[PDB]
Amino acid sequence: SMPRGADQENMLKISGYPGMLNTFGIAQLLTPYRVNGITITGAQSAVVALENKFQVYQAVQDFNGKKLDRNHKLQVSSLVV
Amino acid sequence: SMPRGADQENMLKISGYPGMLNTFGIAQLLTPYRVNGITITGAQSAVVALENKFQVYQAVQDFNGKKLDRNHKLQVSSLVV
Ligand SMILES: [Cl-]
Ligand SMILES: [Cl-]
Structure with a gap:
């Protein structure tokens, strides 16, 4: 799942992604960002460890509000706020 | 990790992928195929569990020989021959 000693x-x-995705599929959703761990927190929610805070900020810009289909829209934010 | 009851x-x-990829990055290589598990077997090799034989065959067609950069090209095959 998640590296134990992460920041x-x-x-x-x-x-907001489709609940069908497993943890590997969540990493696939975020290509090409390096993903170091994923914790599933709900039917359609997770926390994902990226490389550093610059990757986090750019990932937010790239994916937040993105429409996946008619019934799914991504909500993406930095954990530390 | 790899589920024990996988076939x-x-x-x-x-x-043949860059050795700096982790298990999540190997799944990302294979987007959008559903990945159910991954076992690292070497510095630049792994075994990946897909959904069925049709996915294995099409993943081989799609990814065998794919050039990732000047020094890296993928070798992809069915595990069982
Ligand atoms: Cl996907
Ligand atoms: Cl949720």
Whole structure:
């Protein structure tokens, strides 16, 4: 799942993807960002460890509000805020 | 990690990617195929569990020989011959 000794500044919160995705599929959703761990927190929500805070900020810009289909829209935010 | 009850007929062998990829990055290589598990077998090799034999066959067609950069090209095959 998640590396035990991670820093919260590298973490991304992501929700709204289709519940069918497993943890590998969540990493696939975020290609090409390096993903170091994923914790599933809900039916359609997870926390994802990226490389550093610059990756987190760019991932937020790239994916937040993105429409996946008619019934799914991504909510993406930095864990540390 | 790799589920214990997985069948080798649903599995592919993948090698030649940059050794700096982790298990999540190997799944990202294979987007959008559903990945159910991954076992690292070497510095630049792994075994990946897909959904069924059709996915294994199409993943081989799609990814075998793919050039990632000047020094890296993928070798992809069915685990069982
Ligand atoms: Cl996907
Ligand atoms: Cl949720």
